[PDB]
């Protein structure tokens, strides 16, 4: 005998994200063996932790994988990244590229700095993270009141700075979709001037990369506003 | 092989209250953790037991959270609540607000009275509940023949009066939908006059609140006739 | 995966005497208690054994 069934109102409907499979039309087909392969990965999240380059704008407004410093203490900040995946200087980092395909995030962002000036050059920088509430810092002195770390040049070329995940909510939206615009700023300042000897290039370049820190996660897979490369 | 099925006459039909679930389109999504929260509750019924204010009408016909008494024994009753969720002086109590979303009720109603006159004031009241059959009481004497309790002023400020659930049927309709109009009345009378000394406000105010008693229950979730706040 | 089904010729058909139940729209509703009641019966057949009057015609 036939089984009686109640046909639900939503029939014939197609679901782009339906949690189930469909009909197989070419069964028993072996998948060409690829056991020789290396370089395989399972989690988009890992791509996120690979540090990639921040795009720093020039007066004539064109980008560099870095920023410059010299024998002076600029009254204002050297560079300033806005902790915000949507944010533009990151527009082209793997971190942001992955993040734009997800609705929310949580955890630490890691900012990586690499000193490429001459071995004979020295100096110290003050990297800081400022949470919202009192507006963005306008002076090293103010910045120094928030989360910060001093970066000393020397034998070791680089420095990993962590922008802590300090927030009201367990998660944060990944995109500038309407306007609360940000989650604070990362600002870089000179503590002491780049110092050096005669015969040395007076202007040193510091490579600036960014990446997802250890704590970090993304969720809710979505589509970004469509775009066209330049 | 395919399973043969008998497709029931009621197909494609949608049920607002269908006892079953539907298709999930965004699975494995974690629900933002809220373990920090307090103040949570599961049963609308509890809201019902929280005493809230009865709206007592004035000559110029405007409402008060209470009623007044003085150094006299008004031949008629001081106030009179009609045991009937639909009833209007309750129009705005949590009890009634919840009750209008349900078709039937059972159990005790608790009427709460709070004396706010001066400490130096005294007196006694006679609160009563009259079941139907012989019409609503027109004199303390008659009221006194039904269910009643004497309320004596003194150190303790308040009094909880219970309108007993006395009825032919296990349940009662929550709404004045057509006309048997009521389930009896709650009437408040002066037993003895409010008495006091010179230098004391002669007219004391008694706060009047109502709530569902302990025994009390509601059932069959429904929709009230739609309304618009003034 | 979805289960494949063969839809019988008699679909969408309604049966006044269908040996089965239909969809419930107001569940968990308690049936007003009537334990006090007397005089209850289960079989129409009993009514049949209660003697009642024959109608005898006059001229």
């Amino acid at each position: 005998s036939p089984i009686a069934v109640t046909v639900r109102e939503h029939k014939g409907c197609f679901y782009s994200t339906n949690p189930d499979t469909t009909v197989p039309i070419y069964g028993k087909t072996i998948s060409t063996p690829n056991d020789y392969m290396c370089g395989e990965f399972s989690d988009l999240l890992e791509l996120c932790k690979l540090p990639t380059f921040l795009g720093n704008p020039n007066s004539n407004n064109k980008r560099y994988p870095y920023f410059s410093a010299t024998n002076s203490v600029p009254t204002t900040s050297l560079v300033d990244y806005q902790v915000a995946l949507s944010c533009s200087c990151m527009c082209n980092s793997m971190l942001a590229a992955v993040a734009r395909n997800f609705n929310q995030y949580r955890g630490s962002l890691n900012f990586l700095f690499v000193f490429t000036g001459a071995a004979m050059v020295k100096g110290k920088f003050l990297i800081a993270y400022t949470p919202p509430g009192a507006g963005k810092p306008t002076t090293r002195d103010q910045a120094m009141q928030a989360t910060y770390a001093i970066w000393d040049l020397g034998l070791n070329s680089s420095f990993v700075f962590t922008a802590p995940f300090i927030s009201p909510t367990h998660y944060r939206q990944t995109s500038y979709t309407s306007a609360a615009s940000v989650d604070g700023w990362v600002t870089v300042w000179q503590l002491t001037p780049l110092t050096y000897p005669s015969g040395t290039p007076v202007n040193s370049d510091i490579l600036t990369l960014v990446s997802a820190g250890d704590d970090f996660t993304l969720r809710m897979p979505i589509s970004p506003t469509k775009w066209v490369p330049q | 092989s395919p399973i043969a099925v008998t497709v029931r006459e009621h197909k494609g039909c949608f049920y607002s209250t269908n006892p079953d679930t539907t298709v999930p389109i965004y699975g494995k999504t974690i629900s933002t953790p809220n373990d920090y929260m307090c103040g949570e509750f599961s049963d609308l019924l509890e809201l019902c037991k929280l005493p809230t204010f009865l709206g007592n009408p004035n000559s110029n016909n405007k409402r008060y959270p209470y009623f007044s008494a003085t150094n006299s024994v008004p031949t008629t009753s001081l106030v009179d609540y009609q045991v009937a969720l639909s009833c209007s002086c309750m129009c705005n109590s949590m009890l009634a607000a919840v009750a209008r979303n349900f078709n039937q009720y059972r159990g005790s109603l608790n009427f709460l009275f709070v004396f706010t006159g001066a400490a130096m004031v005294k007196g006694k009241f006679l609160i009563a509940y009259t079941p139907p059959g012989a019409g609503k009481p027109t004199t303390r004497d008659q009221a006194m023949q039904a269910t009643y309790a004497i309320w004596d002023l003194g150190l303790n400020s308040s009094f909880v009066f219970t309108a007993p659930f006395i009825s032919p049927t296990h349940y009662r309709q929550t709404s004045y939908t057509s006309a048997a109009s009521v389930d009896g009345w709650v009437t408040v009378w002066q037993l003895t006059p409010l008495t006091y000394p010179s230098g004391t406000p002669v007219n004391s105010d008694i706060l009047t609140l109502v709530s569902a008693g302990d025994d009390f229950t509601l059932r069959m979730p429904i929709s009230p006739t739609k309304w618009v706040p003034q | 995966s979805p289960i494949a089904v063969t839809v019988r010729e008699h679909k969408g058909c309604f049966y006044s005497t269908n040996p089965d139940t239909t969809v419930p729209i107001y569940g968990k509703t308690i049936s007003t208690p009537n334990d006090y009641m007397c005089g209850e019966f289960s079989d129409l057949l009993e009514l049949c054994k209660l003697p009642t009057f024959l109608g005898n015609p006059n001229s």
């Binding site: 069964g27 | 699975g27 | 979805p2 289960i3």
Partner: peptide, 25 residues
């Protein structure tokens, strides 16, 4: 691992529902 969340998820045999994984060596 993927975006599939159905219990009764067999009906069609595995080997029909999916390409068969096999290692050359």
């Amino acid at each position: 691992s993927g975006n599939e969340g159905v219990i009764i998820n067999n009906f069609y045999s595995n080997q029909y529902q999916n390409s068969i994984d096999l290692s050359a060596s």
